[PDB]
Design an enzyme around this catalytic site. Structure first.
Site, PDB file in Angstrom:
ATOM      1  N   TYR A   1      34.514  34.437  38.447  1.00  0.00           N
ATOM      2  CA  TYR A   1      35.784  34.086  39.093  1.00  0.00           C
ATOM      3  C   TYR A   1      36.294  34.978  40.230  1.00  0.00           C
ATOM      4  O   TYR A   1      37.139  34.548  41.005  1.00  0.00           O
ATOM      5  CB  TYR A   1      36.865  33.992  38.027  1.00  0.00           C
ATOM      6  CG  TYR A   1      36.660  32.803  37.112  1.00  0.00           C
ATOM      7  CD1 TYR A   1      37.180  31.558  37.443  1.00  0.00           C
ATOM      8  CD2 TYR A   1      35.924  32.912  35.944  1.00  0.00           C
ATOM      9  CE1 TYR A   1      36.989  30.457  36.627  1.00  0.00           C
ATOM     10  CE2 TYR A   1      35.723  31.813  35.115  1.00  0.00           C
ATOM     11  CZ  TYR A   1      36.253  30.586  35.467  1.00  0.00           C
ATOM     12  OH  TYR A   1      36.057  29.496  34.654  1.00  0.00           O
TER      13      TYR A   1
ATOM     14  N   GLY B   1      36.388  36.170  43.619  1.00  0.00           N
ATOM     15  CA  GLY B   1      35.853  35.770  44.906  1.00  0.00           C
ATOM     16  C   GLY B   1      35.513  34.292  44.897  1.00  0.00           C
ATOM     17  O   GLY B   1      36.144  33.514  44.191  1.00  0.00           O
TER      18      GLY B   1
ATOM     19  N   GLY C   1      33.372  32.317  43.409  1.00  0.00           N
ATOM     20  CA  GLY C   1      33.255  31.671  42.109  1.00  0.00           C
ATOM     21  C   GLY C   1      34.581  31.119  41.608  1.00  0.00           C
ATOM     22  O   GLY C   1      35.638  31.701  41.860  1.00  0.00           O
TER      23      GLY C   1
ATOM     24  N   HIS D   1      43.982  34.393  38.138  1.00  0.00           N
ATOM     25  CA  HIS D   1      44.341  34.398  39.568  1.00  0.00           C
ATOM     26  C   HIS D   1      43.945  33.080  40.227  1.00  0.00           C
ATOM     27  O   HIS D   1      44.740  32.477  40.962  1.00  0.00           O
ATOM     28  CB  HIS D   1      43.658  35.564  40.281  1.00  0.00           C
ATOM     29  CG  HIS D   1      44.105  35.740  41.697  1.00  0.00           C
ATOM     30  ND1 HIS D   1      43.263  35.533  42.770  1.00  0.00           N
ATOM     31  CD2 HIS D   1      45.307  36.092  42.223  1.00  0.00           C
ATOM     32  CE1 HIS D   1      43.924  35.758  43.893  1.00  0.00           C
ATOM     33  NE2 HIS D   1      45.163  36.103  43.592  1.00  0.00           N
ATOM     34  N   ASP D   2      42.726  32.614  39.969  1.00  0.00           N
ATOM     35  CA  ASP D   2      42.226  31.382  40.550  1.00  0.00           C
ATOM     36  C   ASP D   2      43.076  30.193  40.067  1.00  0.00           C
ATOM     37  O   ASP D   2      43.441  29.307  40.841  1.00  0.00           O
ATOM     38  CB  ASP D   2      40.772  31.133  40.174  1.00  0.00           C
ATOM     39  CG  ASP D   2      39.804  32.109  40.816  1.00  0.00           C
ATOM     40  OD1 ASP D   2      40.139  32.801  41.786  1.00  0.00           O
ATOM     41  OD2 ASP D   2      38.660  32.273  40.363  1.00  0.00           O
TER      42      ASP D   2
ATOM     43  N   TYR E   1      46.418  30.177  41.805  1.00  0.00           N
ATOM     44  CA  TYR E   1      46.335  29.619  43.145  1.00  0.00           C
ATOM     45  C   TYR E   1      46.297  28.110  43.095  1.00  0.00           C
ATOM     46  O   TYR E   1      46.926  27.436  43.906  1.00  0.00           O
ATOM     47  CB  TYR E   1      45.089  30.125  43.874  1.00  0.00           C
ATOM     48  CG  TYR E   1      45.255  31.397  44.681  1.00  0.00           C
ATOM     49  CD1 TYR E   1      46.330  32.269  44.483  1.00  0.00           C
ATOM     50  CD2 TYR E   1      44.311  31.735  45.624  1.00  0.00           C
ATOM     51  CE1 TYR E   1      46.452  33.427  45.221  1.00  0.00           C
ATOM     52  CE2 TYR E   1      44.431  32.897  46.366  1.00  0.00           C
ATOM     53  CZ  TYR E   1      45.495  33.733  46.163  1.00  0.00           C
ATOM     54  OH  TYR E   1      45.563  34.892  46.918  1.00  0.00           O
TER      55      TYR E   1
ATOM     56  N   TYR F   1      53.292  36.078  52.782  1.00  0.00           N
ATOM     57  CA  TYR F   1      54.492  36.307  51.985  1.00  0.00           C
ATOM     58  C   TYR F   1      55.088  37.671  52.322  1.00  0.00           C
ATOM     59  O   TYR F   1      54.557  38.397  53.172  1.00  0.00           O
ATOM     60  CB  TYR F   1      54.185  36.183  50.485  1.00  0.00           C
ATOM     61  CG  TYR F   1      52.940  36.910  50.013  1.00  0.00           C
ATOM     62  CD1 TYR F   1      52.897  38.295  49.969  1.00  0.00           C
ATOM     63  CD2 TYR F   1      51.827  36.213  49.564  1.00  0.00           C
ATOM     64  CE1 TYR F   1      51.766  38.963  49.532  1.00  0.00           C
ATOM     65  CE2 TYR F   1      50.701  36.872  49.114  1.00  0.00           C
ATOM     66  CZ  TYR F   1      50.674  38.255  49.093  1.00  0.00           C
ATOM     67  OH  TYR F   1      49.549  38.931  48.642  1.00  0.00           O
TER      68      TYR F   1
ATOM     69  N   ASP G   1      49.097  37.138  43.258  1.00  0.00           N
ATOM     70  CA  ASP G   1      48.414  38.292  43.821  1.00  0.00           C
ATOM     71  C   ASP G   1      48.843  39.582  43.129  1.00  0.00           C
ATOM     72  O   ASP G   1      47.987  40.401  42.760  1.00  0.00           O
ATOM     73  CB  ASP G   1      48.682  38.370  45.314  1.00  0.00           C
ATOM     74  CG  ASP G   1      47.861  37.381  46.115  1.00  0.00           C
ATOM     75  OD1 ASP G   1      47.089  36.583  45.513  1.00  0.00           O
ATOM     76  OD2 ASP G   1      47.933  37.309  47.361  1.00  0.00           O
TER      77      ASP G   1
END
Ligand SMILES: [Ca+2]
Length: 119
Positions: free
Chosen positions: A27, A29, A31, A47-48, A51, A67, A93
């Protein structure tokens, strides 16, 4: 935006070149699938997903949205001038940067074969 996220990481994990987190596990990057290989990968998985949620907001593009945030004296803050998109992305983030700082880094998990190991 990615540039800001990179800076968040440089500020929470100054001891690592930020690029160590740009291609790690399933995950971190590029992936975005399979079984997270470890805690750091789990940081990136949320995180993914974070998003993906933020993308539901109209015109919200997490890799690109600029932001308002601050990293000072060991603390990361998302500022109040942020709109819903900015606030959401910034939080994703911020939480990931903090998560990364507390996760063990296993060199063996850097740059793994996504096609083979992340189904
Ligand atoms: Ca990813």
């Amino acid at each position: 935006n990615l540039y800001q996220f990179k800076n968040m990481i440089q500020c929470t994990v100054p001891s690592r070149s930020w690029a160590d987190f740009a291609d790690y596990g399933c995950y971190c990057g590029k992936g975005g699938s399979g079984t997270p290989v470890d805690d750091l990968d789990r940081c990136c998985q949320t995180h993914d997903n974070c998003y993906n949620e933020a993308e539901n907001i109209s015109g919200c593009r997490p890799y690109f949205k600029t932001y308002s945030y601050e990293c000072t004296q060991g603390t990361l803050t998302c500022k109040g001038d942020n709109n819903a998109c900015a606030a959401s992305v910034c939080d994703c983030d911020r939480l990931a940067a903090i998560c990364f700082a507390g996760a063990p880094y296993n060199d063996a998990n850097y740059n793994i074969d996504l096609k083979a190991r992340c189904n």
